[PDB]
Amino acid sequence: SMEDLIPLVNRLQDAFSAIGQNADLDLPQIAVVGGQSAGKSSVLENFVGRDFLPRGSGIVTRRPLVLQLVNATTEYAEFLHCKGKKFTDFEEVRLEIEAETDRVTGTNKGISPVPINLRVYSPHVLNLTLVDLPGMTKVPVGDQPPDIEFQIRDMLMQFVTKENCLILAVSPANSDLANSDALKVAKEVDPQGQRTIGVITKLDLMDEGTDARDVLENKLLPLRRGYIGVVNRSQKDIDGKKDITAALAAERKFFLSHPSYRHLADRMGTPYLQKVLNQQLTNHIRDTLPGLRNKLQSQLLSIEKEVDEMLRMYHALKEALSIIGNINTT
Amino acid sequence: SMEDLIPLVNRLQDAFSAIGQNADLDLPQIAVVGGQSAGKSSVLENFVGRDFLPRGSGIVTRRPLVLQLVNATTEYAEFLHCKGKKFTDFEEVRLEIEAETDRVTGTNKGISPVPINLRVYSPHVLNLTLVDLPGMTKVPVGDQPPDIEFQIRDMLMQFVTKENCLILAVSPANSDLANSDALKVAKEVDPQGQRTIGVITKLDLMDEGTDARDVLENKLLPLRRGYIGVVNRSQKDIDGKKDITAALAAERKFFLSHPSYRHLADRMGTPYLQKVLNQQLTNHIRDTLPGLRNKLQSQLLSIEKEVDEMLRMYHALKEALSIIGNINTT
Amino acid sequence: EDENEKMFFLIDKVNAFNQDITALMQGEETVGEEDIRLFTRLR
């Protein structure tokens, strides 16, 4: 099912394109939440395979950013509000997000619940929707109110209550797992974990007296899709702009040497974590497939009897039906 | 006093930031009002010193534009509805603003109540709010409904009632001069004319046989500052993209013949209107400053005499007081 | 003088405590909203 998910989604969309109809699978969105310095942006963007999201200390992300990932040959990004500009420098992308926030909220640290829309094209993605959210905080800056923390909480609540929202509950290893701000919210809304995927980062820096052995075998506090362990960038790391390859390499290696995880090594890393998130997508995809097929048949009939001379439709429609079948068979 | 006020206002915001209080001066807004086709955009842009307001045939101001000016190093513009968009060409800026108005209403006599949101950054401006408003009318033209007057009128009235609103009172010649939309609004808010300058535009197009002679001689209802007339860009002028300097040249010709204005000729022109308005603005800023200063003094004292060991206050407060003092002395 | 300033705060407090003691000895003290004064409860 991991092999079947990537190509089949692109194949179905491509047929739709030729018909010139707005037909999408509507892959469920994933939102990352957690206290300040959890590593929230790092987790999401590493899946995408690029450094392009603003990352933390203090309040950084002051507006949600709704990113749609697009399968494409070349790796670059461009914003809806900047028609024609093609960014090839992802650091410039990051910076542009910040600037765009200033436009609406003013330049004294203001925040707005209105999303900035960015499309990042790469050939290593499904056409999904991911959401980077502002961190929880302790002290106001600029003209932010005294209750800034709670306002930011609200903002992410409007995305995480949305049916079929995979919540990446990100928790820093230098704080106890019970005191996790991320975990609190996740447990409030979806306690059993029907759409919660627990991600525990910073495995190499964890305070003595904690471990993930029970957690990853789905034993301590069971989640439906389980838990995937990661060794992500620390706050020191993010400040220094530690790049993707470096973080990923030490992370994978970690699980092979640790006595408590080596026999479960094959269900650890980037490869497994990737598998999990994609896995949720797969279930929704298939169920939605009857609906589209029907729409296409109906459209043809009308115009023909009133002869519009738009006979091009006729041929387009036939094509779509074949593609649909193949996905259903897997 | 305008010249010394400008820099001190920016400095005051910085001190406030350090205290971690949401304290702003709330600079009063200025709104330009007038009949349909009045030259309203011309007047406003002349004050600002830039071509950025859309002008056209027939109906010109077709949507309100709420522009907030922001002190910043770089010169550029950004729309609320166009998140992230980068120009860098101010001629292009003008074009883009114009385009957005066409988007909803077309160029076939228009109207829409939905504001266009624009932030223009510059390092030589006040953090001000200026408003271009739809022209009020008395009789329908083009495809406008019979009740056009009542829809437009309401819209602009929400801005001009705001305390300390410098009214650029433009009065159309294609409506009766005693029935002046400009003079009505201007008189309502500031009857004595400390900041109201009665301006009659388009004087060369007035219907044969009408005039406001007593009022216009500053005798009927005497105003301290009187009345200053102007003759702004005509229909041919707007069509051609006639530039700013040019428009002023047409003014001269009319004024020498009109019986009601020749004796007051030396107190005429656009340039003279400019001088007066600036002076009023400064007054508001200063008035709010004493109140804050006092609060700061009180807080410090307590801890000092009992020295609470909370010496951090001492330093913060001291800073704020210095900035306040300098503005108060002027 | 900052020495004088410092003297005011401490020196003022200590006396005020003692003055209330005098009220307590005489069945005059200030008492809580629906309490009874010491002198009456003894009776």
PDB file of N, CA and C in Angstrom, chain A residues 86-152:
ATOM      1  N   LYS A  86       9.421  33.623  -9.258  1.00  0.00           N
ATOM      2  CA  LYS A  86       9.870  32.256  -9.054  1.00  0.00           C
ATOM      3  C   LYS A  86      11.108  32.302  -8.152  1.00  0.00           C
ATOM      4  N   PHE A  87      10.966  31.989  -6.896  1.00  0.00           N
ATOM      5  CA  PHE A  87      11.969  31.837  -5.890  1.00  0.00           C
ATOM      6  C   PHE A  87      12.759  30.561  -6.122  1.00  0.00           C
ATOM      7  N   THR A  88      14.077  30.629  -6.112  1.00  0.00           N
ATOM      8  CA  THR A  88      14.905  29.419  -6.217  1.00  0.00           C
ATOM      9  C   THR A  88      15.712  29.225  -4.912  1.00  0.00           C
ATOM     10  N   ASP A  89      15.635  30.217  -4.068  1.00  0.00           N
ATOM     11  CA  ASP A  89      16.333  30.271  -2.801  1.00  0.00           C
ATOM     12  C   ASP A  89      15.246  30.052  -1.740  1.00  0.00           C
ATOM     13  N   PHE A  90      15.269  28.891  -1.090  1.00  0.00           N
ATOM     14  CA  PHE A  90      14.299  28.623  -0.018  1.00  0.00           C
ATOM     15  C   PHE A  90      14.460  29.437   1.239  1.00  0.00           C
ATOM     16  N   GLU A  91      15.601  30.051   1.489  1.00  0.00           N
ATOM     17  CA  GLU A  91      15.763  30.917   2.624  1.00  0.00           C
ATOM     18  C   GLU A  91      14.971  32.166   2.344  1.00  0.00           C
ATOM     19  N   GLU A  92      14.974  32.643   1.115  1.00  0.00           N
ATOM     20  CA  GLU A  92      14.186  33.716   0.637  1.00  0.00           C
ATOM     21  C   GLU A  92      12.711  33.407   0.746  1.00  0.00           C
ATOM     22  N   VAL A  93      12.295  32.186   0.503  1.00  0.00           N
ATOM     23  CA  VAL A  93      10.934  31.746   0.723  1.00  0.00           C
ATOM     24  C   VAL A  93      10.518  31.969   2.170  1.00  0.00           C
ATOM     25  N   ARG A  94      11.378  31.536   3.073  1.00  0.00           N
ATOM     26  CA  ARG A  94      11.114  31.587   4.499  1.00  0.00           C
ATOM     27  C   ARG A  94      10.855  33.030   4.856  1.00  0.00           C
ATOM     28  N   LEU A  95      11.783  33.891   4.466  1.00  0.00           N
ATOM     29  CA  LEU A  95      11.739  35.313   4.721  1.00  0.00           C
ATOM     30  C   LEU A  95      10.492  35.954   4.189  1.00  0.00           C
ATOM     31  N   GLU A  96      10.037  35.588   3.027  1.00  0.00           N
ATOM     32  CA  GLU A  96       8.879  36.106   2.381  1.00  0.00           C
ATOM     33  C   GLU A  96       7.630  35.849   3.192  1.00  0.00           C
ATOM     34  N   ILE A  97       7.506  34.721   3.845  1.00  0.00           N
ATOM     35  CA  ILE A  97       6.391  34.412   4.706  1.00  0.00           C
ATOM     36  C   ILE A  97       6.309  35.447   5.812  1.00  0.00           C
ATOM     37  N   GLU A  98       7.432  35.778   6.432  1.00  0.00           N
ATOM     38  CA  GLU A  98       7.460  36.749   7.500  1.00  0.00           C
ATOM     39  C   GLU A  98       6.970  38.116   7.019  1.00  0.00           C
ATOM     40  N   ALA A  99       7.500  38.617   5.934  1.00  0.00           N
ATOM     41  CA  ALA A  99       7.160  39.869   5.299  1.00  0.00           C
ATOM     42  C   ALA A  99       5.672  39.992   4.988  1.00  0.00           C
ATOM     43  N   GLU A 100       5.052  38.945   4.530  1.00  0.00           N
ATOM     44  CA  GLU A 100       3.677  38.866   4.107  1.00  0.00           C
ATOM     45  C   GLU A 100       2.776  39.032   5.316  1.00  0.00           C
ATOM     46  N   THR A 101       3.182  38.524   6.475  1.00  0.00           N
ATOM     47  CA  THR A 101       2.466  38.683   7.722  1.00  0.00           C
ATOM     48  C   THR A 101       2.397  40.158   8.136  1.00  0.00           C
ATOM     49  N   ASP A 102       3.472  40.899   7.964  1.00  0.00           N
ATOM     50  CA  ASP A 102       3.569  42.309   8.262  1.00  0.00           C
ATOM     51  C   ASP A 102       2.518  43.112   7.523  1.00  0.00           C
ATOM     52  N   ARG A 103       2.240  42.820   6.281  1.00  0.00           N
ATOM     53  CA  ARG A 103       1.263  43.445   5.468  1.00  0.00           C
ATOM     54  C   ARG A 103      -0.091  43.597   6.143  1.00  0.00           C
ATOM     55  N   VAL A 104      -0.591  42.548   6.761  1.00  0.00           N
ATOM     56  CA  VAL A 104      -1.899  42.543   7.371  1.00  0.00           C
ATOM     57  C   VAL A 104      -1.936  42.907   8.847  1.00  0.00           C
ATOM     58  N   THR A 105      -0.998  42.419   9.628  1.00  0.00           N
ATOM     59  CA  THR A 105      -0.918  42.595  11.079  1.00  0.00           C
ATOM     60  C   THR A 105      -0.117  43.799  11.611  1.00  0.00           C
ATOM     61  N   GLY A 106       0.522  44.514  10.730  1.00  0.00           N
ATOM     62  CA  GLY A 106       1.379  45.632  11.086  1.00  0.00           C
ATOM     63  C   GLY A 106       2.740  45.087  11.485  1.00  0.00           C
ATOM     64  N   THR A 107       3.714  45.959  11.757  1.00  0.00           N
ATOM     65  CA  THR A 107       5.083  45.500  11.982  1.00  0.00           C
ATOM     66  C   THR A 107       5.565  45.620  13.447  1.00  0.00           C
ATOM     67  N   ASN A 108       4.600  45.515  14.354  1.00  0.00           N
ATOM     68  CA  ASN A 108       4.929  45.463  15.766  1.00  0.00           C
ATOM     69  C   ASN A 108       4.503  44.122  16.411  1.00  0.00           C
ATOM     70  N   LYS A 109       4.915  43.023  15.775  1.00  0.00           N
ATOM     71  CA  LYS A 109       4.660  41.638  16.228  1.00  0.00           C
ATOM     72  C   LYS A 109       3.235  41.079  16.170  1.00  0.00           C
ATOM     73  N   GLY A 110       2.357  41.766  15.462  1.00  0.00           N
ATOM     74  CA  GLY A 110       0.964  41.368  15.407  1.00  0.00           C
ATOM     75  C   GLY A 110       0.675  40.022  14.772  1.00  0.00           C
ATOM     76  N   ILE A 111      -0.475  39.448  15.118  1.00  0.00           N
ATOM     77  CA  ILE A 111      -0.871  38.160  14.582  1.00  0.00           C
ATOM     78  C   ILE A 111      -2.258  38.259  13.934  1.00  0.00           C
ATOM     79  N   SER A 112      -2.560  37.365  13.016  1.00  0.00           N
ATOM     80  CA  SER A 112      -3.798  37.279  12.288  1.00  0.00           C
ATOM     81  C   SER A 112      -4.095  35.809  12.012  1.00  0.00           C
ATOM     82  N   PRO A 113      -5.386  35.414  12.091  1.00  0.00           N
ATOM     83  CA  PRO A 113      -5.848  34.046  11.834  1.00  0.00           C
ATOM     84  C   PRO A 113      -6.015  33.764  10.328  1.00  0.00           C
ATOM     85  N   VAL A 114      -5.849  34.756   9.491  1.00  0.00           N
ATOM     86  CA  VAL A 114      -5.912  34.649   8.054  1.00  0.00           C
ATOM     87  C   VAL A 114      -4.620  34.006   7.502  1.00  0.00           C
ATOM     88  N   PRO A 115      -4.734  32.829   6.859  1.00  0.00           N
ATOM     89  CA  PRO A 115      -3.592  32.130   6.275  1.00  0.00           C
ATOM     90  C   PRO A 115      -2.928  32.792   5.071  1.00  0.00           C
ATOM     91  N   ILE A 116      -1.640  32.577   4.941  1.00  0.00           N
ATOM     92  CA  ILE A 116      -0.829  33.039   3.841  1.00  0.00           C
ATOM     93  C   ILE A 116      -0.785  31.767   2.997  1.00  0.00           C
ATOM     94  N   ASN A 117      -0.980  31.885   1.692  1.00  0.00           N
ATOM     95  CA  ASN A 117      -1.025  30.720   0.827  1.00  0.00           C
ATOM     96  C   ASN A 117       0.206  30.483  -0.007  1.00  0.00           C
ATOM     97  N   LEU A 118       0.858  29.363   0.227  1.00  0.00           N
ATOM     98  CA  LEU A 118       2.080  29.016  -0.486  1.00  0.00           C
ATOM     99  C   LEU A 118       2.062  27.614  -1.055  1.00  0.00           C
ATOM    100  N   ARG A 119       2.520  27.447  -2.278  1.00  0.00           N
ATOM    101  CA  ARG A 119       2.589  26.166  -2.947  1.00  0.00           C
ATOM    102  C   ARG A 119       4.053  25.793  -3.125  1.00  0.00           C
ATOM    103  N   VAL A 120       4.486  24.684  -2.549  1.00  0.00           N
ATOM    104  CA  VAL A 120       5.834  24.188  -2.746  1.00  0.00           C
ATOM    105  C   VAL A 120       5.760  22.897  -3.570  1.00  0.00           C
ATOM    106  N   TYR A 121       6.250  22.906  -4.762  1.00  0.00           N
ATOM    107  CA  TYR A 121       6.410  21.907  -5.729  1.00  0.00           C
ATOM    108  C   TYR A 121       7.639  21.074  -5.512  1.00  0.00           C
ATOM    109  N   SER A 122       7.547  19.754  -5.571  1.00  0.00           N
ATOM    110  CA  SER A 122       8.661  18.823  -5.463  1.00  0.00           C
ATOM    111  C   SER A 122       8.158  17.501  -5.987  1.00  0.00           C
ATOM    112  N   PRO A 123       9.051  16.602  -6.416  1.00  0.00           N
ATOM    113  CA  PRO A 123       8.551  15.344  -6.980  1.00  0.00           C
ATOM    114  C   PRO A 123       8.356  14.248  -5.928  1.00  0.00           C
ATOM    115  N   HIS A 124       8.599  14.559  -4.680  1.00  0.00           N
ATOM    116  CA  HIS A 124       8.592  13.657  -3.546  1.00  0.00           C
ATOM    117  C   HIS A 124       7.408  13.851  -2.588  1.00  0.00           C
ATOM    118  N   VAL A 125       6.289  14.259  -3.107  1.00  0.00           N
ATOM    119  CA  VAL A 125       5.090  14.528  -2.430  1.00  0.00           C
ATOM    120  C   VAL A 125       3.821  14.126  -3.014  1.00  0.00           C
ATOM    121  N   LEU A 126       2.740  13.751  -2.492  1.00  0.00           N
ATOM    122  CA  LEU A 126       1.388  13.652  -2.729  1.00  0.00           C
ATOM    123  C   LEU A 126       0.797  15.017  -2.749  1.00  0.00           C
ATOM    124  N   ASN A 127      -0.321  15.328  -3.343  1.00  0.00           N
ATOM    125  CA  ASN A 127      -0.943  16.599  -3.404  1.00  0.00           C
ATOM    126  C   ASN A 127      -1.819  16.603  -2.148  1.00  0.00           C
ATOM    127  N   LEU A 128      -1.406  16.887  -0.994  1.00  0.00           N
ATOM    128  CA  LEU A 128      -1.764  17.046   0.358  1.00  0.00           C
ATOM    129  C   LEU A 128      -1.874  18.472   0.832  1.00  0.00           C
ATOM    130  N   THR A 129      -2.367  18.705   2.042  1.00  0.00           N
ATOM    131  CA  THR A 129      -2.398  20.021   2.668  1.00  0.00           C
ATOM    132  C   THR A 129      -1.796  19.938   4.057  1.00  0.00           C
ATOM    133  N   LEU A 130      -0.705  20.580   4.346  1.00  0.00           N
ATOM    134  CA  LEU A 130      -0.022  20.656   5.602  1.00  0.00           C
ATOM    135  C   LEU A 130      -0.126  22.069   6.162  1.00  0.00           C
ATOM    136  N   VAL A 131      -0.134  22.251   7.454  1.00  0.00           N
ATOM    137  CA  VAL A 131      -0.328  23.497   8.123  1.00  0.00           C
ATOM    138  C   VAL A 131       0.665  23.726   9.249  1.00  0.00           C
ATOM    139  N   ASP A 132       1.398  24.835   9.186  1.00  0.00           N
ATOM    140  CA  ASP A 132       2.372  25.200  10.208  1.00  0.00           C
ATOM    141  C   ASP A 132       1.635  26.179  11.116  1.00  0.00           C
ATOM    142  N   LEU A 133       1.689  25.955  12.420  1.00  0.00           N
ATOM    143  CA  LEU A 133       0.958  26.806  13.356  1.00  0.00           C
ATOM    144  C   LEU A 133       1.804  27.488  14.408  1.00  0.00           C
ATOM    145  N   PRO A 134       1.332  28.649  14.900  1.00  0.00           N
ATOM    146  CA  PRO A 134       2.113  29.433  15.859  1.00  0.00           C
ATOM    147  C   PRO A 134       2.280  28.628  17.139  1.00  0.00           C
ATOM    148  N   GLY A 135       3.419  28.803  17.808  1.00  0.00           N
ATOM    149  CA  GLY A 135       3.657  28.043  19.016  1.00  0.00           C
ATOM    150  C   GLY A 135       2.913  28.668  20.180  1.00  0.00           C
ATOM    151  N   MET A 136       2.717  27.929  21.249  1.00  0.00           N
ATOM    152  CA  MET A 136       2.231  28.452  22.520  1.00  0.00           C
ATOM    153  C   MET A 136       3.340  29.243  23.200  1.00  0.00           C
ATOM    154  N   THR A 137       3.019  30.355  23.868  1.00  0.00           N
ATOM    155  CA  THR A 137       4.052  31.204  24.468  1.00  0.00           C
ATOM    156  C   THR A 137       3.789  31.583  25.918  1.00  0.00           C
ATOM    157  N   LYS A 138       4.752  32.243  26.541  1.00  0.00           N
ATOM    158  CA  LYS A 138       4.634  32.635  27.940  1.00  0.00           C
ATOM    159  C   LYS A 138       4.636  34.135  28.223  1.00  0.00           C
ATOM    160  N   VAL A 139       5.301  34.897  27.354  1.00  0.00           N
ATOM    161  CA  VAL A 139       5.346  36.346  27.509  1.00  0.00           C
ATOM    162  C   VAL A 139       5.061  37.044  26.182  1.00  0.00           C
ATOM    163  N   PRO A 140       4.248  38.118  26.219  1.00  0.00           N
ATOM    164  CA  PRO A 140       3.909  38.939  25.045  1.00  0.00           C
ATOM    165  C   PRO A 140       5.054  39.804  24.540  1.00  0.00           C
ATOM    166  N   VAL A 141       5.029  40.114  23.251  1.00  0.00           N
ATOM    167  CA  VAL A 141       6.052  40.959  22.636  1.00  0.00           C
ATOM    168  C   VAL A 141       5.353  41.898  21.660  1.00  0.00           C
ATOM    169  N   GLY A 142       5.945  43.056  21.407  1.00  0.00           N
ATOM    170  CA  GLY A 142       5.303  44.014  20.527  1.00  0.00           C
ATOM    171  C   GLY A 142       3.966  44.469  21.105  1.00  0.00           C
ATOM    172  N   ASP A 143       2.910  44.485  20.313  1.00  0.00           N
ATOM    173  CA  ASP A 143       1.607  44.846  20.807  1.00  0.00           C
ATOM    174  C   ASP A 143       0.673  43.676  21.135  1.00  0.00           C
ATOM    175  N   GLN A 144       1.246  42.478  21.262  1.00  0.00           N
ATOM    176  CA  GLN A 144       0.453  41.315  21.620  1.00  0.00           C
ATOM    177  C   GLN A 144      -0.129  41.485  23.020  1.00  0.00           C
ATOM    178  N   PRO A 145      -1.359  40.991  23.224  1.00  0.00           N
ATOM    179  CA  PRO A 145      -2.047  41.117  24.506  1.00  0.00           C
ATOM    180  C   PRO A 145      -1.369  40.246  25.564  1.00  0.00           C
ATOM    181  N   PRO A 146      -1.778  40.386  26.840  1.00  0.00           N
ATOM    182  CA  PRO A 146      -1.240  39.558  27.926  1.00  0.00           C
ATOM    183  C   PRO A 146      -1.631  38.088  27.746  1.00  0.00           C
ATOM    184  N   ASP A 147      -2.778  37.802  27.175  1.00  0.00           N
ATOM    185  CA  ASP A 147      -3.256  36.481  26.883  1.00  0.00           C
ATOM    186  C   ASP A 147      -2.932  35.905  25.475  1.00  0.00           C
ATOM    187  N   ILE A 148      -1.771  36.328  24.960  1.00  0.00           N
ATOM    188  CA  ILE A 148      -1.265  35.855  23.667  1.00  0.00           C
ATOM    189  C   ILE A 148      -1.287  34.322  23.529  1.00  0.00           C
ATOM    190  N   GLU A 149      -0.819  33.618  24.552  1.00  0.00           N
ATOM    191  CA  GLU A 149      -0.794  32.164  24.565  1.00  0.00           C
ATOM    192  C   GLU A 149      -2.143  31.555  24.198  1.00  0.00           C
ATOM    193  N   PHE A 150      -3.208  32.027  24.817  1.00  0.00           N
ATOM    194  CA  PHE A 150      -4.540  31.530  24.606  1.00  0.00           C
ATOM    195  C   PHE A 150      -5.133  31.902  23.270  1.00  0.00           C
ATOM    196  N   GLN A 151      -4.668  32.983  22.679  1.00  0.00           N
ATOM    197  CA  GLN A 151      -5.191  33.404  21.402  1.00  0.00           C
ATOM    198  C   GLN A 151      -4.625  32.470  20.344  1.00  0.00           C
ATOM    199  N   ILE A 152      -3.347  32.147  20.452  1.00  0.00           N
ATOM    200  CA  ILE A 152      -2.645  31.270  19.541  1.00  0.00           C
ATOM    201  C   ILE A 152      -3.232  29.860  19.650  1.00  0.00           C
TER     202      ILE A 152
END
